[PDB]
Amino acid sequence: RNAFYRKLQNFLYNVLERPRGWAFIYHAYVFLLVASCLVLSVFSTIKEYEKSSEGALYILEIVTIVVFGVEYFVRIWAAGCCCRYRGWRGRLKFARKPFCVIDIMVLIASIAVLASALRSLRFLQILRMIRMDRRGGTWKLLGSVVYAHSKELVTAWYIGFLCLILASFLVYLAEKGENDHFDTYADALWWGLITLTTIGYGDKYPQTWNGRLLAATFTLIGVSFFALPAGILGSGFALKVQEQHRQKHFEKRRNPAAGLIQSAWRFYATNLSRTDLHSTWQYYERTVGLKVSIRAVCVMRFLVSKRKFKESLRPYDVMDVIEQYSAGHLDMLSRIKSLQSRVDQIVGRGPAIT
Amino acid sequence: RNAFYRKLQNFLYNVLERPRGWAFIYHAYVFLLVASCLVLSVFSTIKEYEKSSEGALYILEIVTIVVFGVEYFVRIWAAGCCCRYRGWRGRLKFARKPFCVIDIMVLIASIAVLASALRSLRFLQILRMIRMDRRGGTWKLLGSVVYAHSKELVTAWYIGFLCLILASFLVYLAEKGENDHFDTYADALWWGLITLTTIGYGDKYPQTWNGRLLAATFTLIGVSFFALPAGILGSGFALKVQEQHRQKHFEKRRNPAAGLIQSAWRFYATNLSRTDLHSTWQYYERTVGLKVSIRAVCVMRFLVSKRKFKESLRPYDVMDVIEQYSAGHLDMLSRIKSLQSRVDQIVGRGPAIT
Amino acid sequence: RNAFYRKLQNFLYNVLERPRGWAFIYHAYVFLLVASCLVLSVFSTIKEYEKSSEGALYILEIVTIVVFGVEYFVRIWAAGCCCRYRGWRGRLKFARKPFCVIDIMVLIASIAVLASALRSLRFLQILRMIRMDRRGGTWKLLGSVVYAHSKELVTAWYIGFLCLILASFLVYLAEKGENDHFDTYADALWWGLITLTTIGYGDKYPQTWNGRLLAATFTLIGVSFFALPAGILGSGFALKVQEQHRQKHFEKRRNPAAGLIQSAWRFYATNLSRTDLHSTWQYYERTVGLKVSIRAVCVMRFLVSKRKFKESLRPYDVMDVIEQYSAGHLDMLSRIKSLQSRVDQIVGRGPAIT
Amino acid sequence: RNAFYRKLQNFLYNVLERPRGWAFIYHAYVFLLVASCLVLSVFSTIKEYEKSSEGALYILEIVTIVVFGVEYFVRIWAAGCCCRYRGWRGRLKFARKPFCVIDIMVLIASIAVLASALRSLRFLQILRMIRMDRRGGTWKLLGSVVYAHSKELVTAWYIGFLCLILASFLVYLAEKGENDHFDTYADALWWGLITLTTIGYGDKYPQTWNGRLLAATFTLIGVSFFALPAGILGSGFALKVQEQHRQKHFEKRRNPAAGLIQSAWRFYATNLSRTDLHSTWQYYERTVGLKVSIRAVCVMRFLVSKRKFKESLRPYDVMDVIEQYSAGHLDMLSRIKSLQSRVDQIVGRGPAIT
Amino acid sequence: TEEQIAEFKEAFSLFDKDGDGTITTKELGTVMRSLGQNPTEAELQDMINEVDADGNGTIDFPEFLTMMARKMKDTDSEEEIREAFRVFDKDGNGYISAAELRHVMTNLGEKLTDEEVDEMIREADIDGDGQVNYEEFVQMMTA
Amino acid sequence: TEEQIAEFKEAFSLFDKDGDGTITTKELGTVMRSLGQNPTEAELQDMINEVDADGNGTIDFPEFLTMMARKMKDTDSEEEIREAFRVFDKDGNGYISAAELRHVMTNLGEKLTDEEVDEMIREADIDGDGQVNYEEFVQMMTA
Amino acid sequence: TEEQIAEFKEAFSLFDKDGDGTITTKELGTVMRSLGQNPTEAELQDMINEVDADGNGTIDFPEFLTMMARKMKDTDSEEEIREAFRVFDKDGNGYISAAELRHVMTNLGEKLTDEEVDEMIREADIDGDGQVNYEEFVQMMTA
Amino acid sequence: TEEQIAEFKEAFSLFDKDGDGTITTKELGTVMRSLGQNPTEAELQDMINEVDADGNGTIDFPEFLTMMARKMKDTDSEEEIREAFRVFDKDGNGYISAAELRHVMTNLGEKLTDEEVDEMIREADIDGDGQVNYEEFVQMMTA
Ligand SMILES: C=C(C)[C@@H]1CCC(C)=C[C@H]1c1c(O)cc(CCCCC)cc1O
Ligand SMILES: C=C(C)[C@@H]1CCC(C)=C[C@H]1c1c(O)cc(CCCCC)cc1O
SS (H, E, C) chain E: CHHHHHHHHHHHHHHCCCCCCECCHHHHHHHHHHHCCCCCHHHHHHHHHHHCCCCCCCCEHHHHHHHHHCCHHHHCCCHHHHHHHHHHCCCCCCEEEHHHHHHHHCCCCCCCCHHHHHHHHHHHCCCCCCEEEHHHHHHHHHC
D198-226: string of b/e by CB count within 10 Å (b at 16+)? bbbbbbbbbebbebbbbbeebbbbbbbbb
b/e code E97-110 from CB counts within 10 Å (16+ = b): ebeebbebbeebbe
G129 interface with H at CB cutoff 8 Å: yes
β E131-133/H95-97 pair status:
unpaired
CB A181 within 8 A of CB D43: no
What gap in Å lies between CA D253 and CA D247, rounded to an integer? 10
Q: Give residues with Cβ within 8 angstroms of B9, minimum separation 6.
A: B77, B78, B81
Of F67, D165, C45, the closest CA to residue B306 belongs to: F67
Q: Which of D199, F128, G109 is nearest to A197 (CA)?
A: D199
Q: How far apart are the first and last CA of chain G?
A: 22
Contact with chain H for residue F6, Cβ under 8 A: no
Contact E116, A269 (CB under 8 A): yes
Per DSSP, helices labelled H in chain F are 2-15, 25-35, 41-51, 61-69, 72-75, 79-88, 98-105, 114-124, 134-142
Among residues C265, B10, B90, the alpha carbon closest in space to that of H77 is found at C265
For residues F56 and F40, what is the distance between their CA atoms, to the nearest angstrom?
Answer: 19
Q: Which amino acid is at B148?
A: A
CA distance F79 to F86: 10
- The fold for domain A136-314 equals Helix Hairpins (1.10.287)
Instruction: Give the residue from C152, C212, C219, C318 with the most B CB atoms within 10 Å of its CB, the best one to mutate.
Output: C152
The string of DSSP codes covering B135-167 is: S-HHHHHHHHHHHHTHHHHHHHHHHHHHHHHHH
Buried b (16+ CB within 10 A) or exposed e, E1-12: eeeeeebbeebb
Pick the CATH number of B161-230 from 1.10.600.10, 3.20.20.70, 3.40.640.10, 1.10.287.70: 1.10.287.70
Q: Evaluate: CB of D196 within 6 angstroms of ligand 2.
A: no
Q: Domain D141-314 falls in which CATH fold?
A: Helix Hairpins (1.10.287)
Smallest CA–CA separation between F55 and chain B, in Å? 16
Specify the DSSP class assigned to residue G22: B
The response to whether H16 counts as a known ligand-binding position is yes
Q: Which of C230, C237, C335 is closest, CB to CB, to D340?
A: C335
Is E80 an 8 Å CB contact of chain F? no
User: C2-134, which class in CATH?
Assistant: mainly alpha
- Whole-angstrom CA distances from B183 to B186, D207, G4 are 9, 31, 93
Q: Where are the alpha helices (DSSP H) in G16-133?
A: 25-35, 41-51, 61-69, 72-75, 79-88, 98-105, 114-124
- Taking the C-alpha atoms of residue B46 and residue G102, their distance in angstroms, rounded to an integer, is 87
Is residue B200 a contact partner of residue A200, using CB atoms and an 8 Å limit? yes
Count of CB atoms within 10 A of residue B6's CB?
Answer: 10
Q: Which of residues 8-47 of F touch B (CB under 8 A)?
A: 8, 10-11, 13-15, 31-32, 34-37, 43, 46-47
Interatomic CA distance for residues G101 and G108, integer angstroms: 10
C283/H113 CB distance under 8 A: yes
Closest chain F residue by Cα to residue E66:
F129
Give the separation between CA D62 and CA D42, rounded to whole angstroms: 17
F contacts of B282 (beta carbons < 8 Å): 115
C-alpha–C-alpha distance, residues B297 and F11, integer Å: 11
Q: Classify D279 as helix, strand or coil.
A: helix
* Resolution in Å, one decimal place: 3.5
For residue C306, the chain H residues in CB contact (below 8 A) are 75, 77, 80
The CA distance from B213 to B220, in Å, is: 11
Structure-derived torsion over alpha carbons of residues D260, D261, D264, D269, reported in degrees to the nearest 10: -150
User: Which 3 state secondary structure label does DSSP give H106?
Assistant: coil
Q: Least CB-CB distance to A306: which of E68, E77, E123?
A: E77
Ramachandran assignment for H132, one of left (phi > 0), alpha (psi -120 to 50 degrees), beta (any other): beta
Measured between alpha carbons, how far is residue C260 from residues B142, C268, D275, H73 in Å?
52, 12, 50, 16
Cβ(F91)–Cβ(F64) below 8 Å: no
3 state SS of C136: coil
| Nearest-by-Cβ selection for D336 from C47, C122, C335 | C335
Q: Using DSSP, state whether G77 is helix, strand or coil.
A: coil
- Judged by DSSP in three states, G25 sits in helix
CATH class of F6-69: mainly alpha
User: CA A205, CA C33: separation in Å to the nearest integer?
Assistant: 30
First-residue to last-residue Cα distance in chain C: 85
Distance CA D193, CA D221 (A): 13
Q: What is the dihedral of CA D233, D239, D242, D247, to 10 degrees?
A: -110
Beta bridge partners of F95: F133
Distance between CA D232 and CA D145 in Å, rounded?
A: 9
Question: Among B229, B60, B209, which residue's Cα sits nearest to residue B146?
Answer: B229
Q: For residue E94, is it left (φ>0), alpha (ψ between -120 and 50) or beta?
A: left
What does the alpha-carbon distance between residue H39 and residue C81 come to, in Å, rounded to a whole number?
25
Comparing CA positions, the residue from G14, G135, G126 lying closest to residue G86 is G135
Q: Where are the extended beta strands (E) located within H35-133?
A: 95-97, 131-133
CA dihedral of residues C95, C98, C101, C102 (deg, nearest 10) = -140
Taking CA atoms, B57 is separated from B51, B120, C196, E59, in Å, by: 10, 15, 28, 72
- Backbone φ and ψ for F70, nearest 5 degrees, come out as -60, 135
Pairwise CA distance, residues A55 & A268, whole Å: 73
Give whole-number Cα distances, A69 to A74, A82, A114, B47, in Å.
9, 21, 13, 59
Q: What is the CATH number of domain D2-135?
A: 1.20.120
The pick from D150, D157, D218 for probing ligand 2's pocket by mutation, whose C-beta has the most ligand atoms within 8 angstroms, reads D157
Among positive and negative, which fits the CA dihedral F46, F47, F53, F56?
A: negative
Chain D CB contacts of A199 below 8 Å? 199
Residue F45: HSE in the Cβ half-sphere, 13 Å Cα cutoff: 2
Contacts of C124 (CB under 8 A, 6+ apart): C106, C109, C110, C113
D227 CA distance to ligand 2 middle (Å)? 10
Helices (H), A79-136: 87-95, 98-114, 117-131
Is the distance from the beta carbon of residue D90 to the nearest atom of ligand 2 less than 6 Å? no
Task: Decide if C259 contacts H110 (C-beta within 8 A).
Answer: yes
Q: Is D200 in the pocket of ligand 2 (CB under 6 A)?
A: no
Query: Within a 10 A sphere around the Cβ of H104, how many other Cβ atoms?
Result: 20
Cα four-point dihedral sign C79, C82, C88, C92:
negative
Question: Which runs of consecutive H residues, i.e. helices, occur in chain A?
Answer: 2-16, 23-45, 50-78, 87-95, 98-114, 117-131, 137-148, 150-174, 185-196, 209-269, 279-287, 290-312, 318-353
| CB spacing of B263 vs F110 below 8 angstroms | yes
A353 touching chain C per CB within 8 A: no
Contact indicator for G31, D293 with CB cutoff of 8 Å: yes
Phi, psi of H95, deg, nearest 5? -130, 160
